[PDB]
Every structure is written in C-alpha cells, then in structure tokens.
Amino acid sequence: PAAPESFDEVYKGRRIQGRPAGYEVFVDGVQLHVMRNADGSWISVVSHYDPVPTPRAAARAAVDELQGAPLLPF
C-alpha cells in the first residue's frame, strides 16, 4: 500500500508533476483530481471511466484530453 513515486516531466509541452500527499497531480501547476482504484490503476476527473496503470499515465491522459486547454482548479 505505499504510494507511487513522485514524478516531474514535460509531456506534450506541459509540465506534469505527481507526488504522494493519497496522491496529488498537477498540470502546469494546477491540481488535477486523480483517484486510485482497488486494483492499483488510476483515473483522473478528465478520464474518470478509463483506468490506466499509474498516476503519470493519468496525468499524460489528461494532457492528451486537454488539447492545450488550461486546467481549471478543482
């Protein structure tokens, strides 16, 4: 049950960050709601029906979804 490792990268032009808190993700400094499923997969509020294996994968899915759009604070 320990949390995933933190991460920080530029993905498709945007900075994505993740850190244990139970886990927080940011896209260009704006927090992105993410959640962990029982089986260890992740989703985000902009991909909430679509499990992906890791919080970085959920952050990257959000950047894909956003097509350049600023995230609004949650």
Partner: protein, 276 residues
C-alpha cells in the same frame, strides 16, 4: 410513463425532448445535475464512502438521479420521457441518435467541437459551465479512444451473472453490478463513456445530453437482469460500512433507499421488456 428506445421516437417526440432539455439548461437547472454527478464521482472511493459509483448503489442511485431529471423535463413538457440508447444495436456514428435533429454528431478532429445538432456551441444554446478546464463547448470523439461499443453477446454474458454484487462491493468486485458498471470484465457502462469521448468521458459527463440516454439503457439492463434472475436481489442487506445497504438511505436525497427503487414499474415501464 413509458421509456422508449431513442431509435423509435417520432420527429415530434425528438423535437419535444430537445426543447425540454434546452429549457432546463436555459433556466440553470440542468447545470446543477452536472454538478451533483461530478461531486459524487469525485467523492466515491473504493476504500471509503461510496454511493453513486463503484458500489452496489450505482444502479439505484442512477435510477433515482434519472427520475429527478425526467421529472424536471416533465415540469417543462409533461409528455416528455427519457429515451434509452441501446448501444449494442445502434453502434456506429451513422445511428439516427447522432443526427442533427436529435443529439448532433461527433466533434471535429482539431478540438473535438460538436458542430451540428441542437447542442452545438454555435447555436448559443449549450454553454459548458460546469467544467474542469477552459473549454466551454460540447465535445465528442465517437469511437476515438476505444474502438468498439459493447456487442449484444457481451451484454448477454453480463446479464447471465446471477449475483447482484459481491464483497468488497467496489471496483474490484465480481458480480453483475461491477461487470455492468465495467470496472471488471468485458466492460459495458464505462466503455460507452470512453467511446463517446468529450465531456462524456469526464466527471462532468452529464454535460452531454447522451448521458441520460446511456444511463436509461444501463437502467433497462438492470430491469432485464431482474427478469433473468427473480431469485437474486440487491445486496448487501445490512451492516456494511461505507456502502449503502438495501434499507439504508442514499445521499443526496436522504429520504429514499435502494429498496424503494428496485421495482421500476412504480415509476415507469419500457416500450418492451423481456419476461423471465
């Protein structure tokens, strides 16, 4: 009240449904349904309190949420009822559902923007206000993020499951509810959200009017499951932390229990529903 397959609506019934939905939007009532759904999907967790999603109450909760929305539509036009979208049958972008006289089509590829139908941003009649990002226009990418809607044979495999739900009563469960929801197995409800794309793939998925027609067909599949399994009923039946038991009330209403929602015929019937 009869809920009909969208594919069977007359031109006048499509006109009246669209107008009732647009009036709920204009008056500000529609956006509060979007807001309620997003609040629950953000709060429902597998290891904590869970009511609208990823839990046995997924089905009675959406049944009651859809009843709230249908009653709001009927306050504008009493002849309107919620239609349902059988995505196992109407599975391509050529479906009449997606015609400009009903819901409009897929979004253009540059930015996902829906360009036709009554809910296109250009009409001025469908601002996206309850949102997670700067974009204020309806978006869709039908078939963009997943290649196929569920097939009838897949649906039948799930309908054959006899247990309603099973411990631990969350996204890891075996049983009918979680296979219909889609977190395990060949994936019915979650995959349809992914297939539509745009706001339908997000926590603010009621921003797309197709939300209602999707969940009205999920709700019909629960009624079909009950006819296939008269010896099975909602579980759990008491004393379960974090989960809505059969006789416990559900948020946000607080005054209704899963037990009050098991028999849909108290509220509506379907155009056709298989017998046992």
């Amino acid at each position: 009240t009869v809920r009909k397959n969208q594919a069977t609506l007359t031109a006048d019934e499509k006109r009246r449904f669209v107008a009732a939905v647009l009036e709920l939007k204009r008056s500000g009532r529609y956006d509060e349904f979007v807001r309620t759904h997003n609040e629950f999907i953000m709060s429902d967790t597998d290891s904590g309190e869970r009511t609208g999603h990823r839990s046995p109450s997924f089905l009675p909760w959406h049944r009651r949420f859809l009843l709230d929305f249908e009653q709001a539509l009927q306050s504008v036009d009493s002849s309107v009822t919620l239609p349902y979208w059988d995505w196992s049958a109407d599975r391509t972008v050529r479906a009449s559902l997606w015609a400009p006289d009903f819901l409009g089509g897929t979004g253009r590829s540059t930015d996902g923007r829906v360009m036709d139908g009554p809910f296109a941003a250009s009409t001025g009649n469908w601002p996206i206000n309850v949102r997670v990002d700067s974009r204020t226009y309806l978006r869709r990418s039908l078939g963009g993020s997943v290649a196929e809607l569920p097939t009838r044979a897949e649906v039948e495999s799930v309908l054959a499951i006899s247990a309603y739900d099973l411990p631990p009563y969350n996204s890891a469960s075996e049983g009918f509810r979680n296979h219909l929801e889609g977190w395990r197995g060949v994936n019915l409800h979650n995959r349809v959200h992914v297939w539509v794309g745009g706001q339908m793939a997000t926590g603010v998925s009621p921003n797309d009017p197709v939300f209602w027609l999707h969940h009205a067909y999920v709700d019909k599949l629960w009624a079909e499951w009950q006819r296939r399994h008269p010896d099975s009923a909602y579980v759990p039946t008491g004393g379960t932390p974090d989960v809505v038991d059969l006789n416990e009330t559900m948020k946000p209403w607080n005054t209704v229990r899963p037990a009050d929602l098991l028999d849909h015929t108290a509220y509506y019937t379907f155009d056709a529903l298989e017998h046992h």
